[PDB]
């Protein structure tokens, strides 16, 4: 009767969660004055990519940017002057993710080759060479993030994630429990826990130390494409293909707000917060990004100017700008 | 701008020049995508097979009349494919391969073709359809051990159109079965699309070597369609 008690446990989850909540965040935040209309102006347009872009990542110094594209090149941009610090050719032109190390020393990439390539930017030779080629996944990689410049976290299309040690090159830890493809990651600000969304409308909160799924959140109805912690680390926002974002609290273990509107029908490709977490920026398939109030769930602004599908979005650490990269091979910086 | 800034700008200009050179070189070639099922013979569509960029996905290169062709096959993925398929939305065409000899899996092939045809990302991508193992189908229909109508009742109530395409004058039942399969596939294809993308059915064998010519001609036709639609002529 293992199956029967499985749905019994899932049923009591409903009772426990209902007993946990008495009201909604809308009533609590109704007293807050609206943020108002926000108009974001484009400052720089980083051009040079000759193919559609899937991923980007800002630097810790809030100036350097890394972009990946189907052209087969990783491009490092000095966002202040729109220069090109580095152009790294790739072994495989199919890449779906990229990462910039917190120390600014290494750059990760991967895609439809089941291998995560790590490049050392700072070398005595003066060029960029493949420092490592982590292999062992049996599916396409969807995202990868540097933990502390010596270990990395990836998620693949074989419905699992992994924590690799760069020096050894082997999977130090393996995280399993997802039914469908894992498509997003988000490291906690303290780099102790991380959430990951899968193609089952399911997000999972994992502990990186013990390597086990601490919590599971549901509530969407389609594939999950993006995820991002709240700046304080006690909550996270999730984007899915059903044209809606959802805010989850780790401790409350429930829905908090649902960001959706009748006008939008297209899926969501990227989700990011602001420095203080007040603004939620989400890239859509409607060729433009939307900016919602986190505590009000209303469309506070629209970022338009892209003439193709928006595929990557990133807010800098300083919070002074947000960079968006779409399938037109153009990175636009807004502030 | 100081001296170091000028030197950095010069470095960026050199990187840009290399990028444009690589981009035009890549634009010179032409890309394709291979789709199929197990034991469908999709690995022998082109008589020469290249191990270039051996990874979780197979990559092959060939050339016809001094134009290149990149063909990408996937075998390392799982049953689900709708997630990574969005990568192959700018290819010139999609080569679909169907084993017409057997009849149990024809419905599965038709369902797969329906899924590919109506995919949200492959709306404007044309499909070149290959019906592999035509000799095996001919042998099966000549032997008569496996009745065709056991799976498709509408085959019995179907008459061959007055199109005497087969020059060799093969057995009429062979032609009837071939035309029935092609009719099914083109009915699945034509039901949607409104002319944005069209299918090019073809018949091939395990011994046929004139497969590169058909792919080249279909790619030429597709590029012609793109150019005509660009000039608002469709």
């Amino acid at each position, epitope marked *: 009767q293992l199956r029967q008690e499985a749905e019994q446990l899932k049923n009591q989850i409903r009772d426990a969660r209902k007993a946990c909540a008495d009201a909604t965040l809308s009533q609590i935040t109704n007293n807050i004055d609206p943020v108002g209309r926000i108009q974001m102006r484009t400052r720089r347009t980083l051009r040079g990519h000759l193919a559609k872009i899937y991923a980007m990542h800002w630097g810790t110094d809030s*100036r350097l940017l890394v972009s990946a594209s189907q052209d087969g090149k990783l491009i490092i941009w000095d966002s202040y002057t729109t220069n090109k610090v580095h152009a790294i050719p790739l072994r495989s032109s199919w890449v779906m993710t990229c990462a910039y190390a917190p120390s600014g020393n290494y750059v990760a990439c991967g895609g439809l080759d089941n291998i995560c390539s790590i490049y050392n930017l700072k070398t005595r030779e003066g*060029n960029v060479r493949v420092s490592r080629e982590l292999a062992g996944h049996t599916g396409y990689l969807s995202c990868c993030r540097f933990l502390d410049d010596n270990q990395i976290v990836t998620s693949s299309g074989d419905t699992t994630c992994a924590l690799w040690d760069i020096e050894t090159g082997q999977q130090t830890t393996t995280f399993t429990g997802h039914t469908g493809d894992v498509m997003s990651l988000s490291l906690a600000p303290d780099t102790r826990l991380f959430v990951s969304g899968a193609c089952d409308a399911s997000a999972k909160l994992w502990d990186v130390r013990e390597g086990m799924c601490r919590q599971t959140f549901t509530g969407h109805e389609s594939d999950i494409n993006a995820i991002c912690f709240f700046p304080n680390g006690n909550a996270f926002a999730t984007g899915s293909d059903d044209a809606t974002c959802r805010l989850f609290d780790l401790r409350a273990d429930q829905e908090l707000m649902t960001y959706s509107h009748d006008n939008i029908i297209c899926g969501i490709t990227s989700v990011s917060f602001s420095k203080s977490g007040r603004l939620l920026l989400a890239g859509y398939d409607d060729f433009n990004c939307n900016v919602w109030d986190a505590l009000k769930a209303d469309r506070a602004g629209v970022l338009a100017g892209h003439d193709n599908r928006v595929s990557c979005l990133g807010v800098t650490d300083d919070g002074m700008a947000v960079a968006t990269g779409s399938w037109d091979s153009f990175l636009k910086i807004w502030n | 701008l*100081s*001296a170091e800034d*000028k030197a950095a700008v010069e*470095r960026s200009k*050199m990187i840009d020049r290399n990028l444009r050179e690589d981009g035009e070189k890549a634009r010179r070639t032409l890309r394709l995508l291979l789709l199929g099922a197990d034991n469908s013979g999709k690995s022998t569509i082109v008589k020469q097979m290249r191990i270039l960029h051996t990874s979780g996905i197979f990559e092959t290169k060939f050339q016809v009349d001094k134009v290149n062709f990149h063909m990408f096959d996937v075998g390392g993925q799982r049953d689900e494919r709708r997630k990574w398929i969005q990568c192959f939305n700018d290819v010139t065409a999609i080569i679909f391969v169907v084993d017409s000899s057997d009849y149990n899996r024809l419905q599965e092939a038709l369902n797969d073709f329906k899924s590919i045809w109506n995919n949200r990302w492959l709306r404007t991508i044309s499909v070149i359809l290959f019906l592999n193992k035509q000799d095996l189908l001919a042998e099966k229909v000549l032997a008569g051990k496996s009745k065709i109508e056991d799976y498709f009742p509408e085959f019995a109530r179907y008459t061959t159109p007055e199109d005497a395409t087969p020059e060799p004058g093969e057995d009429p039942r062979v032609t009837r079965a071939k035309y029935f399969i092609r009719k099914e596939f083109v009915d699945i294809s034509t039901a949607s699309g409104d002319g944005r993308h069209i299918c090019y059915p073809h018949f091939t064998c395990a011994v046929d070597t004139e497969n590169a010519r058909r792919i080249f001609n279909d790619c030429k036709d597709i590029i012609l369609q793109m150019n005509l639609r660009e000039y608002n002529l469709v």
Partner: single-chain antibody
Amino acid sequence: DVQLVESGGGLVQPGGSRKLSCSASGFAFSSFGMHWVRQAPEKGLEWVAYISSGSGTIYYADTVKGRFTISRDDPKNTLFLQMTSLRSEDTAMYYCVRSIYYYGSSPFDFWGQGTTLTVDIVMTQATSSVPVTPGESVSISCRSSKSLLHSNGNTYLYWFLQRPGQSPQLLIYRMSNLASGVPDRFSGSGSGTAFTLTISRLEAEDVGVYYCMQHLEYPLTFGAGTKLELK
């Protein structure tokens, strides 16, 4: 692996001609700018010529402008210096200097061995020679006619250590950071036109001349040099 070897020096006559060759191995020479730097036997370092990456911008010193020619050869990784009408002031040691320029580069990290050939902004060091005691902290300072701080929040000052019979290295670049391989006991500071470099605890390998360079392509002037004598 990084090696730069110079050749072509020797005895010449005034009004003659000479060719200097710099062979570089171990790194991507085609992506590094190169410098030819002169050092008189009893005076100190002096900039001569600069060739950019990809053989683009070319810069010559005022003294050797119109007489010295600098050229690059990527396929064989070689730097050529043609000298015509040699004079009595051209006798000195010539060094091949590596350089690279991007946002966070170190454009004077490596220096060649150099060869001996025999026939603006003023950058003044505070002293010329000071005695030091091993184990304690010493300080050096130098000033410039014009403030090196730029509009983009960058000050272009470089510090070089030359031990006797050894090619000078790069210690501190732009005042921003310590070059790779330099022990984290050297410290750079200052502002405007006046800058200082401090050593917390010397050793036996810190004996040598200390130069400070401002970075403007046309002048590219060095400092006087304040050698430290062990005592």
